[PDB]
Amino acid sequence: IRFERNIVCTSDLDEGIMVVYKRNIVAHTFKVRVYQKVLT
Amino acid sequence: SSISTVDSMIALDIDPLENTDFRVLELYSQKELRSSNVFDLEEIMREFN
């Protein structure tokens, strides 16, 4: 029974710039012409 | 008083957890949500009227 130094004590990931894009949901809007005649 | 001293204190300074005010993140605005439809009911009803 002899004491001894058996206690040995010993003691940022990826920084960066980020840009986040979402999935576009707006419906595509274009111009439509409708020709027609009215007979009354 | 130059004989010096002994700093036997084992430092255990644990920084407090900083406060965080969570944002109310909004991905799509209400305008995009209303514009994300092939058919709009208000337009159809207005044209019928």
From Swiss-Prot, chain A:
It comes from the Viruses. It is found in: Virion membrane; Host cell membrane; Host endosome membrane; Host Golgi apparatus membrane. A proteolytic cleavage by host furin generates two subunits that remain linked by disulfide bonds. Homotrimer; disulfide-linked. Binds to heparan sulfate proteoglycans. Interacts with gH/gL heterodimer. Interacts with host C-type lectin CD209/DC-SIGN. Interacts with host ITGB1, EGFR, and PDGFRA. Envelope glycoprotein that plays a role in host cell entry, cell to-cell virus transmission, and fusion of infected cells. May be involved in the initial attachment via binding to heparan sulfate together with the gM/gN complex that binds heparin with higher affinity. Interacts with host integrin ITGB1, PDGFRA and EGFR that likely serve as postattachment entry receptors. Also participates in the fusion of viral and cellular membranes leading to virus entry into the host cell. Membrane fusion is mediated by the fusion machinery composed at least of gB and the heterodimer gH/gL. Belongs to the herpesviridae glycoprotein B family. This is Envelope glycoprotein B. It comes from Human cytomegalovirus (strain Towne). The gene is gB.
